Each structure stands twice: as structure tokens, then as C-alpha cells.
């Protein structure tokens, strides 16, 4: 019914600022409230503030007062969140949320903008095999190591192989680079017949890798 | 500001049973003008933004199944899920919107409680491809276990490793209600080529005693 289209993922160095946009369409363009809510890794939702794009009135959570500025352009139904003096505590998904009237659904959410606060440079991953070596079933996989920023996607056999696939959450290493593992369990009897290729995509570095994984 | 304190942090409930999630406001969130409690409940799942379930403490949002209900009594708020379904596995948040500034509770993770299931354990040496680069990653996979609590202990020539591994865990599988976990031991190529016996020892309540998977470097 309503789409809140957010700007794309951002990387910032510590001490820099970030400005995220949210553009509404479908219902209204003036007198509603737009809220900003974020979620940092391993943390709960955190309410940041609201803006009334018609009046320009704002109200910020106490912990962001003096560091966040919300603005609105009623003419393009747009709201902006500008956050200064960034630290790694500001690495988060940032969601815009429209407050609706009575009659229908009470709210609509954007899909989120990921902001990563880090001194790391953009780097595509290395892809290493986890080669099959257990009761009729074999495990194999791909280790996707040393990339920045998130995310990477992994599929198997161009997305034709879904049964028994587990792609783990990425871990952040002390280097400031991420690592991710994807595994699949298959019948041991299939290791001779069937080919297994992990399809890795790191869009931030324009890095796509296909790795065939076979017994050593 | 008004604080919202949720409990419990984690809830495991059998399929078709009742889940109860609690939230305590630090102050009244009741309007004297309309006698509504300014409390909302949200459901947050992977691949979708947070979803409003309940507003004014007890009013269900359009399109929310009737197995979701909310109650408010002074500073105590409850979200009840009757007949819990696998699709209900999520983090639930309360929120107050009584004041101009809003506050979320810290969240409650709801999972399906299934019977205990021991992990299947697999170990992977570093690839020869990786060894060219001066780092070695040794991987241990724990597949399809319940509950989520598991201990992985790496050993290298029987020395217990601490601080040089990282792990991560899948979301609960919708069909079998299990978890999987991968642990990665990172060490220098020099250390890898110096030592011989690489072991992943797994402790879990589905096992009588810890399970060890090991390899000898070069075999
Ligand atoms: C409606 C509601 O309860 N909450 C909304 C309301 O918040 C108000 C505070 O906002 P202010 O900007 O005013 O002040 C900032 C600070 O938080 C205080 C609200 O808390 C107060 O208005 C008190 O409400 P009631 O006890 O219902 O009394 C109202 C009336 O009955 C009474 O005042 C007399 O007229 C009655 O004779 O407006 C926000 C801004 O749009 C919304 O975001 C909130 O969701
Ligand atoms: O097809 S998808 O874009 O889903 C994933 C893509 O990376 C697959 N590339 C193939 C792999 C097999 C050899 C030919 C190239």
C-alpha cells in the first residue's frame, strides 16, 4: 500500500557523519510523523527520533541529542537522518517508519539502510573449500574469508541445491574483516556422481566467485 | 524517560502451546483522557522489517492472527501467543509511545521447544589453497542440534585453545526446529605446520560425554 524507499548501504570512518534518506509513496506526502529506529549487531531495536515533515518539528532520544539532525522535504515526501561523530557503536541497520492515521494499518516500515563504521578498506573475499572427508551423509562447504564490508551471499549449484544448506552469520575478525562459512550435507554416495559449486557474491567489491568443492 | 523492561530474555515453547512475554513500564503509560495504555508489541523476523502486532496494549493490528493477544494492567503488559506455530519464531519487542520520546523493551527471543537432539560433528583442515597465504583456518561444524547451548573446545597437540576461535549459529530450522553452529580456529601457517593433532571437542546435553572429531595434519 505504502513504500518507504531508503538510500543504499554506507561505510564511514570513525568521527565522520552519515546521512540516510527515506522517500515515501502510496499514501500522503505532508502531515504524518516519520520515525527512525536502528538495530546494532546483537542489540535490540533503538528508537532515535521523529520528524513531522510538514512542520519540520523534531524530537530526538536523549542519547542522540546534539549528534543527530532529522530534516524533511514535503515536496518529494522525503525524510533524512544525519548522524555525526560516528563510532563502531553506530554500525547498525537504520529503519524509517511512517506513523499513519486511523482507518487502516497504523504504521509502515522501510527495509533498512546498513551503515558500517570502520577504518577498513573495501576488499573482496578469498573462497576456500571445506572438502568432504558420517552415517551415509557427508558435509562440505565454502569458507568465505577476509571481506569488507558486509554482506556476502552464498548459493549452491546456482540455487538449485537448497536441502541441507546452512550459511552461518558472518563474524568480524580482529583485522576488521569479516568471515563467513556455508555448508551443505549430501548423501556420501553422491560425492562420485554430483558436482557441488558454491556461488559467492560480494557486491560491494564487485567480486563473484564460483568454487567447485570435491574430495581431497 | 519511560523504561520498558521485558522478561524473559529467551522463551522456548512446544508447538501448539502458549507463549507469554512480559513487559514492565517504569511509569504509567495510561492516558487519563481515553483510558488507553500507549503500548505496542512488535514481531521481528529475518528478511522483514519489524511488524506491529498490537497497539493500545490490547488492539490487534489488521492481518495479525487471532492467536496473538495483548493485555495491560497498570505498569504490567503481556503478549500472549496461543497455539504457537513455527512461523511465530521471532524476537518480540514491547514499546511505549505515551511520551513524545518512544522506548523499546530489550526484546524476547521465542523459539520452538523440541526434544533434545545431539549434534552431528564434522572437522575440516585448512585447504592447501589457504596455506599459501600465511594463515590457516580449521573449521568444526555442529549440525542439527537442540537446544542451542553447546560448548566447542579446540585442542592442538592436546593444548586447550582459548581466544583464537570464533563461532556463529543459524536461526532455528522451520521444519526440524534444530540449530547448526560453525567454529573457526585461526592460527598462523607457521603454528599449523609445527603441530600435528587438531581436535574439536563438543559438549552438549544430547551427548552422554563429549564427542571429539580430529585429524593429523598431512593425512
Ligand atoms: C497521546 C499520548 O499520550 N502520546 C502522544 C503525545 O504525547 C504527549 C506528550 O507530547 P508533548 O509534545 O505534549 O510533550 C512531550 C513530553 O513527552 C511530555 C502526551 O504524553 C501528553 O500530551 C500527555 O497525554 P495525556 O495524558 O493523554 O494528556 C493529554 C490531554 O488529555 C491533557 O494534556 C489535557 O488537555 C486534558 O485536559 O503526543 C506525542 C507527540 O505527537 C506523541 O508522539 C505521543 O505518542
Ligand atoms: O547462475 S547464478 O548467477 O545464480 C551463480 C553463478 O555464479 C554461476 N556461475 C556458473 C557456475 C558454473 C559454471 C558456469 C558459471
Numbering used by the authors:
A (entry chain HHH): 1 to 133, 138 to 220
B (entry chain LLL): 1 to 219
Verbatim from the authors:
Wall teichoic acids (WTAs) are glycopolymers decorating the surface of Gram-positive bacteria and potential targets for antibody-mediated treatments against Staphylococcus aureus, including methicillin-resistant (MRSA) strains. Through a combination of glycan microarray, synthetic chemistry, crystallography, NMR, and computational studies, we unraveled the molecular and structural details of fully defined synthetic WTA fragments recognized by previously described monoclonal antibodies (mAbs 4461 and 4497). By using an integrated approach that combines microarray, synthetic chemistry, X-ray crystallography, NMR spectroscopy, and computational studies, we showed that S. aureus WTA glycoforms bind the mAbs 4461 and 4497 in a cavity formed between the CDRs of the heavy and light chains. The GlcNAc moiety is a prime recognition element, being inserted in the antibody binding pocket, and the RboP residue to which the GlcNAc is appended and both phosphates interacted with the antibody surface participating in the binding.
Specifically, we revealed that the (α-1,4)-GlcNAc specific mAb 4461 displayed an “end-on” insertion binding mode with the antigen-binding-site amino acids forming numerous contacts with the α-GlcNAc residue and interactions with the RboP backbone. The crystal structure revealed the amino acid residues of both the light and heavy chains involved in binding WTA trimer 1. The carbonyl group of the light-chain residue Y98 was involved in a H-bond with the amide of the GlcNAc at 2.9 Å and with the Rbo-B hydroxyl group 3 at 2.6 Å, while its hydroxyl group made a H-bond with an oxygen atom (not involved in the phosphodiester linkage) of phosphate 1 at 2.8 Å. The carbonyl group of Y97 established two H-bonds, with the GlcNAc C3 hydroxyl group at 2.7 Å and with the GlcNAc acetamide at 3.5 Å. The heavy-chain residue Y33 interacted with the WTA ligand through the hydroxyl group, which could establish a H-bond with the GlcNAc C6-OH at 3.6 Å. Finally, residue S31 established a H-bond with an oxygen of phosphate 1 at 2.8 Å. Although the external Rbo units of the ligand are flexible and Rbo-A is therefore not completely defined in the crystal structure, we observed that RboA as well as phosphate groups 1 and 5 were involved in ligand interactions. The structure also revealed that both phosphate groups are involved in ligand binding. This provides an explanation for the observation with the TA microarray that this mAb binds more strongly to internal GlcAc residues, being flanked by two phosphates, than to GlcNAc appendages of a terminal RboP moiety, having only one neighboring phosphate. The interactions revealed by the crystallographic structure also provided insight into why the α-GlcNAc attached to the GroP backbone is not recognized by the antibody.
